[PDB]
């Protein structure tokens, strides 16, 4: 009976199935794929790449992704609808604002940003009628004044609609703690919030402190590792130096500590990427040729071999996304 | 025989007539009018406002404007084409980058930015086939590293196409001097470059130094004055404290010094403005209800009353734009 909005229209909650909760078709900037599609070879090439990659994920058991691209990540909801149809994978679109708002967003009040986020959830994105099913926000450590307005507008849009909030943060700066403080000052329930990029640290005091408070903890960059590429400074800065198995052990660490219901797993993958260095796709595709099938192909069996029960893994990959995405 | 690209297609140089060389339909951000047109009431309201204002300018004798909105000013070339048709005023569109490039532009090399600017001049903007007729760039004082790449890519696109380059600068910081240094290091002729916002200062050593070197000097913010509003800090910061008559005396100062062929006059007006404080249109429309008719209605007669000959004023408003816009 409960429903989630996707770029193809409403679906029953129970059909979302195995869901990757932090992904992107294309990491770009507002207006960019319309103005310069040849950056990606062509729009058609980008769409075909994305359809191949979603088909691969689907073969591996993924049924839904949440594309957390905001306005300022260059979200193109028509592209999402096209590739969702072609690949037969559900895609949930996002509203919110990430790190790159333009001036026309940076000048706005909390009330104005609230109406923008509500427009995209309740009315539709652009002129398409496609409704966002999640609100994405971002900080590093200490929230800037504008980021604090974004977080408050996200909380107010979530309270009005039931749609959840998901975050980018700097895990090494324990950024989720200030996010949580702002959301709670707005009366937002922690059960509506995922603190993302939490696998970028092994700081289990930070992670268990959020989980104990009821937050979802997004272990969402599973394939990110610059091991083997450490002379590529741009790769190292984005990916890192920890292995995927190190990241995946955090899923088991939280389950072992009683927090299985508080975990969301994903890749933070993409099929095009213009907001970083030229050719970064190419580096990424070498680190992780499986793309968005890496979680079911590598991470889930690794955890099953370490003794995590199948029921617990189904709860993390199916039940927890369903409860998070259901408007509540 | 010479031709200029407009948003309606090619026109003869000689039909551009009285031309305002630095204007905007809407000062916004990439993607913004598509994502949040209700910020402006509606897209239809914005277009109707712009058509009324261009009709008023046309009645006052304006035949062409150059809309120097770049990608990151939220240029919407379909909007420009619509309002140009409805108002029967030619509009030249721009490529280049202003102060608000997103990450997908800020990561690019000089070679990449060159191909983007060339795309918009030679192929067309977005999927529209509408060709830019000018390249807009921006700095304040000292160019940032990325701004220097923008200026070099603009110079290289101009050398390949003949299209001119026009600038935003901080006149109080004499920013045109560093712009000129970069353009000349690229081999760009000063005759292809307008150093804009030059009426924001009364520093005639700065202005005559550029004019002597062959630059066009853009006296382009004629109606900008916060006199009467000086308690509105945002108005003061953008407009200022000098009167329009003070700004217009710079046109006569340069003519009196022998630089009549080096002057371009405009308003830097707009019909919508989302990249600044909410309601700024409203403040602007009170300072200058004549909009883009203020130059022919107020500035030209003021100069004629101070004894500038009609032939000289025709040369500034017709001949100088034609020579500047003609690809050369
Ligand atoms: Co992120
Ligand atoms: Co992401
Ligand atoms: Co400017
Ligand atoms: Co301007």
CB atoms within 10 A of CB B62: 23
Give the contacts of A188 (CB within 8 A, at least 6 positions apart): A155, A158, A159, A165
**Are the CB atoms for B76 and B32 separated by under 8 Å?**
no
Ligand that comes closest to the CA of residue B267: 4
- Residue B11 contacts by C-beta under 8 Å, 6 or more apart in sequence? B3, B4, B90
Cα A328 to middle of ligand 4, angstroms: 46
Closest ligand (CA of B22) = 4
The H or E element that residue B138 is part of is strand B134-138
User: Are A104 and B28 in contact (CB < 8 Å)?
Assistant: yes
Resolved by: X-ray
CB contact (8 A) between residue B119 and residue A38 = yes
What are the residues facing A217 on neighbouring strands? A195, A263
What is the spatial distance between Cα A17 and Cα A317, in angstroms, rounded to a whole number?
8
B107 and A30 within 8 Å at the Cβ level: the answer is: no
CATH number for the domain formed by residue range(s) A1-328: 3.20.20.140
d(CA A79, CA A309): 37
Host H or E run for residue B311: helix B310-314
d(CA B117, CA B137): 11
Residue of A30, A98, A113, A238 to mutate when probing chain B, most B C-beta within 10 A? A30
Longest Cα–Cα distance of chain B, Å, equals: 52
Residue B35 CA to residue A132 CA, distance in Å, equals: 13
3-state secondary structure chain A: CCEEEECCEEEEHHHCCCEEEEECCEECCCCHHHHCHHHHCCHHHHHHHHHHHHHHHHHCCCCEEEECCCHHHCCCHHHHHHHHHHHCCEEECEEECCCCCCHHHHCCCHHHHHHHHHHHHHHCCCCCCCCCCEEEEECCCCCCHHHHHHHHHHHHHHHHHCCCEEEECCHHHCHHHHHHHHHHHCCCCHHHEEECCHHHCCCHHHHHHHHHCCCEEEECCCCCCCCCCCCCHHHHHHCCCCCHHHHHHHHHHHHHCCCHHHEEECCCCCCEECCCCCCHHHHHHHHCCCHHHHHHHHHHHHHHHCCCCHHHHHHHHHHHHHHHHCCC
Q: Which residue in chain B has the smallest CA separation from A273?
A: B104
| Contact residues on chain B for A75, CB-CB shorter than 8 A | none
B277: nearest CA in chain A?
A107
- Can you give the residue ranges of every domain in chain A? 1-328
**Residue A58 φ then ψ, to 5°:** -60, -45
Rounded to an integer, what distance in angstroms lies between the CA atom of residue A89 and that of residue A57? 9
E strand or H helix at B195, and its extent?
A: strand B193-195
Which of A28, A103, A112 is the closest to B278 by Cβ? A112
Provide the token pair at A211: 């989980």
What is the C-alpha to C-alpha distance for residues B72 and B126, in angstroms, rounded to an integer?
13
Q: What is the dihedral of CA A62, A68, A74, A77, to 10 degrees?
A: 60
Neighbours of ion ligand 1 (CB under 5 A): A 168
Nearest CA to B131 among B144, B118, B141, B150?
B118
Binding site: which residues of B? 22, 24, 136, 168, 197, 268
- The resolution, in Å, is 1.2
For residue A228, count other CB atoms closer than 10 A to its CB: 11
Q: Which residues of B are annotated as a binding site for Zn(2+)?
A: 22, 24, 136, 168, 197, 268
Interface test with B, best of A24, A28, A31 (most B CBs within 10 A): A31
| C-alpha triplet A19, A21, A23: angle, nearest 5° | 110
């Amino acid at each position: 009976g409960d429903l989630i909005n996707t770029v193809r229209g409403p679906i029953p909650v129970s059909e979302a199935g195995f869901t990757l909760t932090h992904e992107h078709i294309c990491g770009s900037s507002a207006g960019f794929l319309r103005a310069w599609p040849e950056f990606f070879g062509s729009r058609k090439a980008l769409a075909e790449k994305a359809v191949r990659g979603l088909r691969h994920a689907r073969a591996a058991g993924v049924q839904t992704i949440v594309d957390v691209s905001t306005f300022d990540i260059g979200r193109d909801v028509r592209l999402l609808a096209e590739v969702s149809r072609a690949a037969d994978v559900h895609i949930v679109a996002a509203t919110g604002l990430w790190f790159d708002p333009p001036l026309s967003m940076r000048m706005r009040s909390v009330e104005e940003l609230t109406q923008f986020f509500l427009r995209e959830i309740q009315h539709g994105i652009e002129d398409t009628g496609i409704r966002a099913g999640i609100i994405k926000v971002a900080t590093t450590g200490k929230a800037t004044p504008f980021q604090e307005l974004v977080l408050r507008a996200a909380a107010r849009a979530s309270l009005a609609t039931g749609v959840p909030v998901t975050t980018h943060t700097s895990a090494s700066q324990r950024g989720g703690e200030q996010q949580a403080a702002i959301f709670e000052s707005e009366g937002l329930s922690p059960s509506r919030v995922c603190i993302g990029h939490s696998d970028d640290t092994d700081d289990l005091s930070y992670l268990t402190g959020l989980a104990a408070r009821g937050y979802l903890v997004g272990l969402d960059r599973m394939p990110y590792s610059a091991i083997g590429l450490e002379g590529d400074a741009s790769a190292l800065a984005l990916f890192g130096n920890r292995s995927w198995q190190t990241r995946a052990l955090l899923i088991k660490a939280l389950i072992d500590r009683g927090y299985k219901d508080r975990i969301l797993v994903s890749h933070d993958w993409l099929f095009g990427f213009s907001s970083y260095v030229t050719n970064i796709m190419d580096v990424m595709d070498r680190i992780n040729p499986d793309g968005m099938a890496f979680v079911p192909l590598r991470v889930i069996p690794f955890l099953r071999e370490k003794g995590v029960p199948p029921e617990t893994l189904a709860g993390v990959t199916v039940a927890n996304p369903a409860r998070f995405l259901s408007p509540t």
